[PDB]
Structure 1
Amino acid sequence: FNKEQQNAFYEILHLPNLNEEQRNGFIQSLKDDPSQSANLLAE
């Protein structure tokens, strides 16, 4: 814990319509660049 990296992680994890790969992608880019950690949401 620290950042909104996780706040962002949480959301993208609980995205109802963010289908599978669509989610996995967002979560992983979000491990890779916490900076970018704010980049969330498709549907």
Structure 2
Amino acid sequence: VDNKFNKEQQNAFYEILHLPNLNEEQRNAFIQSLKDDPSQSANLLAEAKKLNDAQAPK
């Protein structure tokens, strides 16, 4: 496990917080699995971005 908090692990965090359309309830779920599984830093991110785009306007 890479608890050292690599670069991508740091970027994934912020990127998840930047999501405007994404609510705190969802963002929390990602941050949760992010700390429990830093390896998903790329997966959860894509899932958060995909979710932020789901609530995105027209």
TM-score, structure 2 normalization:
0.60
Aligned residues, how many?
43
Provide the aligned C-alpha RMSD in A.
2.1
Q: Are 2:4 and 1:4 equivalent residues in the alignment?
A: no
Give unpaired runs (5+ residues) of structure 1.
none
Higher radius of gyration, 1 or 2 = 2
Give unpaired runs (5+ residues) of structure 2.
48-58
**Cα shift readout 1:1-43 (whole Å, capped 9, x = no counterpart):** 4231111001001110111111011111101101111013578
Relative distance call for 1:7 and 1:18 in structure 2 (3 A) is: same
The structure, 1 or 2, with the larger RCO (C-alpha pairs under 8 Å, 6+ apart) is 1
Identity of aligned residues (%): 98
Runs of 4+ in structure 1 deviating by more than 4 angstroms, as ranges, are none
